[PDB]
Structure formats: structure tokens, C-alpha cells
Write a protein that binds this ligand. Structure first.
Ligand code: HEM
Ligand code: HEM
Lengths: 145, 146
């Protein structure tokens, strides 16, 4: 199932993922927080899952939120690094899905991250082409949820 | 023992030794990650109980779940190393990381067992006691949060 989703990650898709990540991943704290704050802004309901982070309205200044945001970016770093080996990508994606499954986060709920990603990419001038590529990576994760 | 006091123990040379060694160790996350875990299970079989979900841990690299876990583990260390410049970021990242281990009832003493495996992997790459002690200091920051 996850393997089949990984099949959509074509040579061109992987190329666009790596190129956009080279920029997005160069500032994990800044872009990580931008992703989370954008998620909370466009989908306020997702805040219910982050009660532990406290006052998320403080953004970057919130240590727990900042801590979570930075860490989030390293999961993506992991995924990006495993792109050329489907076997490694799959085992890493399934390992990652375990905690989210135990947190009762469905594939549809997880998919809400696509909008924030598209916006963050656009702020760096990466158009729809790149947003679509990323939606495909997110789809691999959704397949495991 | 507070995490803020522990983070202050990461002096200039300790940080430098961490970076120099990670440059080599972090080059092969899959290989070194798996070697780290297998060594932990070999030197401290009592810890295997915490990893029931991984299945047959003796299969090593062949075990997909163990491999997935091992690779991921290395990115958490990558995270710590990248935050060495800012004590505030290192701390929030460490406490974040401590949450899931606290939930699995992993104590500071239990976590400290990783020091053995780290020392052996380092030695296999010609990094001696100086570096093992540097890593022990980093591990201590996490212990202070458990
Ligand atoms: C590209 C998307 C995402 C990435 C890379 C990501 C990454 C991570 C990572 C690495 C962790 C920390 C380790 C763990 O506990 O599993 C985490 C925790 C968590 N994630 Fe995800 N995640 C993503 C999207 C989401 C979404 C969309 C939701 C919910 C709507 C979500 C909810 C959670 C929650 C509630 C936690 C615990 C946070 C805490 O209390 O510290 N994640 N995620
Ligand atoms: C260098 C030290 C270590 C690092 C960097 C590390 C890193 C990680 C990471 C990133 C995860 C995945 C995210 C999560 O579920 O929280 C994890 C999971 C886990 N860790 Fe640690 N860990 C270390 C040492 C230990 C030790 C010594 C134990 C136990 C004696 C331990 C027990 C666990 C367990 C039980 C899991 C869940 C495994 C699974 O079910 O997939 N960890 N660790």
C-alpha cells in the first residue's frame, strides 16, 4: 500500500522535492514555525490536537511550539534523504505513522498540511509544480495512516 | 540536574568534538544507526523488552521496523547537533524529545545505557575516549529532562 503510493514519486517529482527542500530545509526553525502557524490559521480545528503546546498564538516565542516545529522538519529531512531507496523510505514512513496513528490522526486530517506547505513554498517562490510534488510525498504518509 | 544547567555544560571544545565526530558518524545514518541499536541489545539484553513492537531484533538490518527506527534515531541526533549554537533551541528540542520517552517510562538511568554503544561505534571509527565523553555530556542533557 505504502509501496504503491511511493511509486508515484517519479524521477521528476523527486527532483522537484530535493530542489525545493534545499531552500525550505535551510531554515528549519523559520519554515517549521511558518508551517505550524499557517496550519492553525487556515484550519483552527487542528489546534485541538496540540493542547500540550499551550498558547500557540505566541508562535515562534512559544518554546514548546518552536521545539515541535523544528523537530517536524527533521522528519521531512529524513523522508527527503530516503527518496532514492523505496525500501528505506517505506520503513521510515511506517515508523513515522505509528505515533500519528496512536494519536488518532486520520489520512484526511493529515492531508490538511498540504495547504500550509503550498503557502510556505510560494513565499519562497516555488509554484504549483512544487506544491504538487509535495502533495505526492504527503500521500505516501497518508497511505500508512 | 535541571536541563538548563546541563545544556550549560556543553562547552566550546565539547561542541567542537561533537561536530567533528558527527561529521563522520552522521555520514552513514543507516549503518551506524543499526550498529548502535544492535550493540545496545547485545550489551543490555534487558532493554529488548521496551522494543517488543520491532519484532525479532536479532535480524538486524534485515528487520524493516528496526531499520526504520534506527535511521530515524539518527535524525534526532542530527537535530541536537544542529541546535548546538543556540542553547534555547537545543533545550526546547530536548524537552520535546523527552516527552515520548517519558511516556514509555524510560528513566534517565535507562537512557544512559546508550553511552556504552555510542562509545563502541565511535571507537570503530577511530574516535577515542575524548569523543565518547563529549557525547556522554550531550546524553546527560537529555537525562536531565527525563
Ligand atoms: C508534513 C507533516 C507533518 C510532519 C512532518 C509531522 C512530524 C511530526 C513529528 C516528527 C512529531 C514528533 C514525534 C512524534 O511524537 O511522532 C510529531 C508530533 C505530533 N504530530 Fe505530526 N507531523 C506532521 C503533520 C501533523 C498533522 C497534520 C497533525 C495533526 C492535524 C499532527 C499532529 C501531531 C501531534 C498532536 C503530535 C504531538 C505534538 C506534541 O504534543 O508535542 N502532525 N509530528
Ligand atoms: C541516543 C539515544 C537515543 C535517541 C537519539 C533515541 C531516539 C528515538 C526516536 C527519534 C524515536 C522515535 C520517536 C518517538 O517515538 O519518540 C525513539 C523511539 C523509541 N525509543 Fe529512543 N532514542 C535513544 C535511546 C533510547 C533508549 C536507551 C531506550 C530504551 C532503553 C529508548 C526507547 C525507545 C522506544 C521504546 C521507542 C519506541 C520504538 C518503537 O516502538 O518504534 N530510546 N527513540
Amino acid at each position: 500500500s505504502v509501496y504503491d503510493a511511493a511509486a508515484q514519486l517519479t524521477a521528476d517529482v523527486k527532483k522537484d522535492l530535493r530542489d525545493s527542500w534545499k531552500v525550505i530545509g535551510s531554515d528549519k526553525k523559520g519554515n517549521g514555525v511558518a508551517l505550524m502557524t499557517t496550519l492553525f490559521a487556515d484550519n483552527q480545528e487542528t489546534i485541538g490536537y496540540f493542547k500540550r503546546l499551550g498558547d500557540v498564538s505566541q508562535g515562534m516565542a512559544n518554546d514548546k511550539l518552536r521545539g515541535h516545529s523544528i523537530t517536524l522538519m527533521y522528519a521531512l529531512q529524513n523522508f527527503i534523504d530516503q527518496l532514492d531507496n523505496p525500501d528505506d523510505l517505506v520503513c521510515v514512513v511506517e515508523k513515522f505513522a505509528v505515533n500519528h496513528i496512536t494519536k488518532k490522526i486520520s489520512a484526511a486530517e493529515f492531508g490538511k498540511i498540504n495547504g500550509p506547505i503550498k503557502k510556505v513554498l510560494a513565499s519562497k517562490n516555488f509554484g504549483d509544480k512544487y506544491a504538487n510534488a509535495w502533495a505526492k510525498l504527503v500521500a505516501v504518509v497518508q497511505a500508512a495512516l
